[PDB]
C-alpha cells in the first residue's frame, strides 16, 4: 500500500514538473521575442 502511494506521488510529481516547465519555458520564450521586438521598435 505505501509503495503504491509512493509510485502515484512520483508520477504526479513528474507530470507537475513537466507542466511547470511548459508554463515557465513558454513565458521565457515570449520574453525573449518581446525584448527583440522592443530593440527593433527602438
Amino acid at each position: 500500500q505505501l509503495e503504491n502511494l509512493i509510485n502515484k506521488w512520483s508520477l504526479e510529481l513528474e507530470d507537475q514538473e513537466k507542466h511547470f516547465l511548459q508554463q515557465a519555458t513558454q513565458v521565457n520564450a515570449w520574453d525573449r521575442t518581446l525584448m527583440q521586438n522592443g530593440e527593433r521598435i527602438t
Binding site: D31, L34, M35, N37, G38, I41, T42
Partner: protein, 48 residues
Amino acid sequence: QKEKQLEDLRYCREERKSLTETAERLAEKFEEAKEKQEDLINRLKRIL
C-alpha cells in the same frame, strides 16, 4: 513590459503619421516651387 511596448507602438504610429503628413506638405511646397520656377523659366524664354 507589454504595457510599455504597447505605448511605444502607439508613439511610433503617431510619429509615423506626423512624418507622413510633413512629407506630404513638403511635397506640395516642392511642386508649387517647381511650377513657379517653370513659369519664371517660361517668362525668361519669352523675354529671350
